[PDB]
């Protein structure tokens, strides 16, 4: 009841944007995708102005994902279609680390919130790699049996990662003993394209079966399935906060779900054949960043 619409409060008119992410203070955000350019914008400027990035970093390969460091304000990691995982400093524009062990496209990178020098990546090479920014070689390698589409650290401990796999399952690992996952969550009928935590115990996933799912990683239980959007092919984005899930759709629409309700609380038509390609909440607030396959960026806000 609280919200029925998404209001557009800003738009940057444009190339697919595969990732849009806020820095540790929700002050800057970065975008990246097929154009081989990591662009950094000032959020307040975008909201207030009638819009140029403050930093642009050219890359050798198409980008699949970004993750800002949670301690070092100025550091951001990228994964690319060559398999390289790069840590960048947005003030100097330099690559700080270039991790080159993946043999195929890396789809995901995630910096840990609680051990901020640690970052994890997953790849079409079927490996999960854990890296430490002070070391050139990977610290942990998990050999899996299928392409890895997303890896995410638990927000409360760097010992746990969720792995979304093309085998249709979420593999939840304790990195202190990688012999077997703690649990493998089955329920999706197609590849699991995203995993994101609402809290220490609540995990959400997206899949090309046109569903989102909510899972309890304390008691290893399925919770809820969310339906309404169309997602049979593309990476269309998933972002969650403590209460809400948002995802893209192949209908060029953003969908929002409350975690307790299986059908959308609202949706927004972006304004064919376009798809939403990236979404990111501004922490626990009703404000979110969104981008689509044309490269348009919008700042949206849930509203009554």
């Amino acid at each position: 009841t609280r919200y029925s619409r998404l209001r557009v409060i800003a738009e940057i008119r444009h190339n697919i944007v595969s990732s849009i992410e806020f820095d540790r203070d929700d002050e800057l955000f970065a975008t990246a995708g097929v154009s081989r350019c990591i662009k950094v914008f000032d959020f307040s400027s975008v909201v207030n102005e009638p819009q140029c990035p403050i930093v642009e970093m050219s890359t050798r390969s198409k980008l699949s994902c970004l993750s800002w460091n949670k301690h070092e304000k100025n550091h951001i990691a990228s994964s690319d279609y060559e398999g390289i995982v790069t840590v960048w400093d947005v003030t100097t524009r330099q690559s700080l680390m270039e991790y080159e062990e993946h043999e195929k496209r890396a789809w995901s990178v995630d910096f840990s919130r609680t051990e901020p020098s640690m970052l994890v990546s997953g790849s079409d090479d079927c490996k999960v790699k854990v890296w430490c920014t002070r070391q050139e070689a990977s610290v942990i390698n998990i050999d899996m049996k299928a392409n890895i589409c997303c890896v995410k650290y638990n927000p409360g401990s760097s010992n746990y990662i969720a792995v979304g796999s093309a085998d249709h399952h979420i593999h939840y690992y304790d990195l202190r003993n990688i012999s077997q996952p703690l649990h493998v969550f089955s329920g999706h009928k197609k590849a699991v394209s995203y995993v994101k935590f609402l809290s220490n115990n609540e995990l959400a996933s997206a899949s090309t079966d046109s569903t989102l799912r909510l899972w309890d990683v304390k008691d290893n239980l399925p919770v809820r399935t969310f339906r309404g959007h169309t997602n049979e092919k593309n990476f269309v984005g998933l972002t969650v906060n403590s209460e809400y899930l948002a995802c893209g759709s192949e209908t060029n629409e953003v969908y929002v779900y409350h975690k307790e309700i299986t059908r959308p609380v609202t949706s927004h038509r972006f304004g064919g054949s376009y798809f939403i390609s990236a979404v990111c909440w501004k922490s626990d607030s009703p404000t979110m960043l969104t981008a689509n396959s044309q490269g348009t960026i919008k700042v949206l806000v849930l509203a009554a």
Partner: peptide
């Protein structure tokens, strides 16, 4: 093909 899930 870009941004296509395996």
């Amino acid at each position: 093909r870009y941004a296509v899930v395996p």
